Paper text:
The inherent challenge for CS is to overcome 4 to 6 log-folds stronger affinity for its natural inhibitor, serine acetyltransferase (SAT), as compared with its affinity for substrate, OAS. Our recent study showed that CS employs a novel competitive-allosteric mechanism to selectively recruit its substrate in the presence of natural inhibitor. Results show that CS uses a noncatalytic residue, M120, located 20 Å away from the reaction center, to discriminate in favor of substrate.
Similarly, M92 interacts with main-chain carboxylic group of T69 with the distance of 3.5 Å and M96 interacts with main-chain carboxylic group of S70 at a distance of 3.7 Å. HiM92A exhibits approximately fivefold increase but in the M120A background, [name] mutation fails to reverse the effect of M120A. However, OAS binding-induced fluorescence quenching of [name] mutants shows species dependency with StM92A showing 62% quenching as compared with 1 to 5% quenching of HiM92A and MtM92A mutants. Mutation of M92 also affected the substrate recruitment although to a lower extent.
Author numbering:
A (entry chain A), B (entry chain A): 2 to 94, 96 to 311
Write the structure that this text describes.
């Protein structure tokens, strides 16, 4: 049928079997690049706005304020326009692409200082909302339960259905933790199957690995955009994570290049990280006959001025 | 279920109702940006390769050769990689984006001369195939019947199904003519409904309008990428075209900007042309109670270095 606005069209993304990764086709990928704003975030942009409306936090008149490095800003920005909200986004004043894309979607952009970076813009966002709390709503991707909820309701059931319940393993890079949390809850709790949930983080910032091992948390710089926030976010449910896999920046990129040239899949850099990690678990006899489903958060063109090209 | 390669995942694209165009929601758009390679072309890349295989023109060993300004090169290029063909693409040596994207997908790129432009590269493609006819296959988007056939089989039936047969008008910019031809054949001949088929061309190169009016064909330069090839291609079936609408380059762009900021739809420049044209037919009493479905060939990020931003 016909979606009332772009927000209602989120998801129903396809499963594609890999040919040059895994073992006799045991690695299938979910292309989240096929969304209204072309990322997994389209799901949480739609559901964080919907839920804020259902509980009167977001009202006709009120104005979205938020800080974004990328995908969620673009997602929350297509939703704002579709549903008729003014939005203000703050960002480490960067990617000229993402700046031009955001102004294109009718976002009132506020640039912070580089040296301060991501936490620079968060502060600035908060100030704008403390200037007039009654007119501003910060949705807060890293802790908003509406983030994991849409993945329990949509991304997870789609995996169940499309695999006919044969899914044995889910692999998901962790940014907010929303996807692995929501997906894992759907299959383990709603559908009653005891899959292996695998979180993927950069080896350069292995904070989930470090936490779970009782070792000093040392975050670090990497090139895998969308994962490796350098802290454990509230929307990563550790309790549902059966395994953590680390990937280096170089491998992730090469794997993203391999996905394009060898499989004809236009995947983002974080997509190369999940697939590198899935490929390793797939070439262990213990996962040989298991069906491994991998989340490919974004598409290639979002990355044209990055190390991916 | 699970697609054997990226080629099998083409289409099943969503219908989104517009809010700031048409009259009481009579204009709904089909987002073809949601495809393996993020355009309508993904459909013809898949089906031109499939059909060449089904009739032994394309064989394991053989090598795709073709000339492309954009979308079909990227489409045929993701298919080549997914199905395991080497491909050579020639192009007016341009858009650095599209160059980097194509090399990214494992395409052996051949650049021609600018001044000669699009017909420059066609010639060069032909030479490469005359150098060794037995190892090269040119698929020829502008006349290959497999182009309109996939739209009769997929894009058209999806419109029928999603609208429940209530579709009254289809609006489609014409590049190859494949989409309007295939879609129109599905609904008029396969489903038996006498819709208005509307072809959209730039007012700067109104060659379809000029032809049908028995007036001298004067092609001209414009900024609407993907339509207005400046000749009538063999895959445009004039016989199924009930009406032709012309749009200027400036309007098309503003409409593409309106689609982003007002509707939260990331559409390409040609998407602004179809919607401008649909909006005019929608605000005539004669189309007031009619359901108008519009083809939005591509997505915004394909256009970041263009006049759209
Ligand atoms: Na596999
Ligand atoms: Na990832
Ligand atoms: Na996750
Ligand atoms: Na990605
Ligand atoms: Na990424
Ligand atoms: Na409308
Ligand atoms: Na068009
Ligand atoms: Na067409
Ligand atoms: Na377009
Ligand atoms: Na276009």
């Amino acid at each position: 049928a016909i979606y009332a606005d772009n927000s209602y069209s989120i998801g129903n993304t396809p499963l594609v079997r890999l040919k040059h990764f895994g073992h006799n086709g045991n690695v299938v990928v979910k292309i989240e690049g096929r969304n209204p704003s072309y990322s997994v975030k389209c799901r949480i942009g739609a559901n964080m706005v919907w839920q804020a409306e259902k509980d009167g936090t977001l009202t006709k008149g009120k104005e979205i304020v938020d800080a974004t490095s990328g995908n969620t800003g673009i997602a929350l920005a297509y939703v704002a326009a579709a549903r008729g909200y003014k939005i203000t986004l703050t960002a480490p004043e960067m990617s000229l692409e993402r700046k031009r894309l955001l102004c294109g979607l009718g976002v009132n952009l506020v640039l912070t200082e580089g040296a301060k970076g991501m936490k620079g813009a968060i502060a600035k966002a908060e100030e704008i909302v403390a200037s007039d709390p009654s007119r501003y709503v910060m949705l807060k991707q890293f802790e908003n339960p509406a983030n994991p909820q849409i993945h329990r309701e949509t991304t997870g059931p789609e995996i169940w259905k499309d695999t006919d319940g044969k899914v044995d393993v889910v692999v998901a890079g962790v940014g907010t933790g929303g996807s692995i949390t929501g997906i894992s809850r759907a299959i383990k709790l709603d559908f009653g199957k005891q899959i292996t949930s695998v979180a993927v983080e950069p080896v350069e910032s292995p904070v989930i690995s470090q936490t779970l091992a009782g070792e000093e948390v040392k975050p670090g710089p990497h090139k895998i955009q969308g994962i490796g926030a350098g802290f454990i976010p509230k929307n990563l449910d550790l309790s549902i994570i059966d395994r953590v896999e680390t990937v280096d920046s170089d491998t992730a990129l090469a794997t993203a290049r391999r996905l394009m040239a060898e499989e004809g899949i236009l995947a983002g850099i974080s997509s190369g990280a999940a697939v590198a990690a899935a490929d390793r678990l797939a070439k262990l006899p213990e996962f040989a006959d298991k069906l491994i489903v991998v989340i490919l958060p974004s598409a290639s063109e979002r990355y044209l001025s990055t190390a991916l090209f």
